[PDB]
Amino acid sequence: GEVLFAVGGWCSGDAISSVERYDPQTNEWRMVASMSKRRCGVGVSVLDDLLYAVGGHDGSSYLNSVERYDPKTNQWSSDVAPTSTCRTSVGVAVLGGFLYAVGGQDGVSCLNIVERYDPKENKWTRVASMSTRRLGVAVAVLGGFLYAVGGSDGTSPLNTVERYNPQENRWHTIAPMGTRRKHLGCAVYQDMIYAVGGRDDTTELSSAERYNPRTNQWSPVVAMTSRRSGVGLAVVNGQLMAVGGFDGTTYLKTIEVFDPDANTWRLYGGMNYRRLGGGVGVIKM
């Protein structure tokens, strides 16, 4: 059984330190321990059964700190080495036992740098930089590759996509999305990379699309019920769930679950708190 954690975010002028846990078996969201820092634009993933919160922005400052949460003790610890620069609206994912931090902004520039965290050494190390600077990038891991999808180069949202080969330590550009998207959500579902929401040049998006590495093609997916920029996306007990965001008017606590058989997204009441640009992580309990 898996549970999903929603971490941090932004609502109505403030960054958020609170954290909540969704239990699929009961469809209930419960508050757990808060982080030491308020963090919006926070990178979140799970490595060796610990939930990581990388960087973000606390409402006053861009952050380079990292903290991690043990569901067994319900404690956050600030015992993780910091990243080499601030990392806000950074994509974070796990590949080969390392936690990667991809893109973001440091407060002065949009980033193409990439570093990875070795939990055995408590150490971050720079690896190959991306071709493109990408704040608000989303990431996913499939077939031994780390994908960097969309983002903004500081001038415009991007439809471009690249993937990282850890054996070569090289990035390669692959097929682009049909829509430019920054602050989108990405996740692997049914061996394709799903990309949902974000903002294009003019609006928060409800649209979605998916990438098949066999064909190197993106294809449209049925749109979500709500437009959602700064949306989280994860698979929990085999179900693809979009979490929170901002629709153009309202900070969102609702969530949506994709039903591939019905080809529709189903909207649910969702979280205790509205969260734009939090992060999500999935723990196997």
């Binding site: 861009y62 609206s89 407060g107 608000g136 903004s152 920029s229 700064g230």
Partner: peptide, 11 residues
């Protein structure tokens, strides 16, 4: 400096 791109208003 500046508000993060994620959160600054568009209107």
């Amino acid at each position: 400096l500046g508000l993060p791109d994620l959160v600054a208003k568009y209107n």
